[PDB]
Amino acid sequence: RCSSLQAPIMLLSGHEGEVYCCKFHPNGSTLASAGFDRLILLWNVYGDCDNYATLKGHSGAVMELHYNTDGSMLFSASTDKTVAVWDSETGERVKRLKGHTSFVNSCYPARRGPQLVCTGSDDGTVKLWDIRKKAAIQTFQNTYQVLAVTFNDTSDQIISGGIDNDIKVWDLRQNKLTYTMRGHADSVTGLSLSSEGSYLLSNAMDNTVRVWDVRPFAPKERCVKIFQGNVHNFEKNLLRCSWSPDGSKIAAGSADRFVYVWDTTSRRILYKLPGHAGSINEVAFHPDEPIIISASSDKRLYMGEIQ
Template identity: 70%
Template structure:
């Protein structure tokens, strides 16, 4: 699969028949693996490089992070009506380092998280869009985050060369 611009993040859909990519052209592309080179959908809305994509646990939604300082949730179901961007989240920050800050879903899909250049881990409620947690501790940009599959624990990785495990209320 060839993209006209540099690709910075990828993931599979839940069936493995599609590849989802984001890059420096500010656009998310959904590719059909069976019909190589075919872009099925282009998700537009971000205004800067996309640094992370993550598929929701049920496979219906995509979370994206961008240098434009927004996280977006997109409806990627096959027959989604009209506008596919269903929610926008803010609070975390990118900066001059232009690190590839990643994002993730909680196992039940009720929360999302993203790293931030302000050295915090941000966790939002997907329904209300409220920031539930702004976890401190790192001394550098938080580049990647993940929720434990069973326990109320966050994992974060930072430019400060540390990994943190932090407990959150479930």
């Protein structure tokens, strides 16, 4: 009906708790995943003889996980209320950053890589972090808890979203943010930005994917498209929306226990992938090969491939 056939897939076991997030390295060789077990998951993935290994040292469950553009380092946000800097290929991590009053909501690297990484904490903290200086960048507070915070492609802007029920645009290098762009509604299922930088795709807790095209330069404050048809979160959940720039695609999780694939520019979605025993927490898309990482509450990562 919707999905096309079945095709082979890879099931990744070993996660004690529900997987919080899933991501892949820029080279596509390894894929790391975070979960409630407070142990990062390194994976030899892109084809399977094996995954990679298990990473430890997190004092609490990792809320978010991401990899640096270089691939040798990665950042993670955990309930330990400390920014997690991890070196991986060296056998041990990077450094542990402190100063968060509450648990770290999300941590993502910027366009400068290890130089600065945008992060936020459920206390409502929106803060850039310098790393290689053995100290962060700067701290800021806007309204309320920011669910997701990520820097733009030019590293000069930082987009964030959370319980504040608004689209958060932040200017950074000016020691102040950018603008607050929101319609009339309150929902946050997550926040995301496209790779082109001309639009941002945020997840709405009403089960409504909101793609907004505004972009820098000429004033717009416009939108992109309204994606629907799949329920991302039933009541309250954190879903990481990762779009697939290959062709045109948008990947997201769902509370229906099915991976959510959405085509956008066609004014309709893509496909729904069943086979998950629980609600999908996060999904990823490999740039090199058409593979998608499936992280769900079932603690089993399902990586699909299109042939």
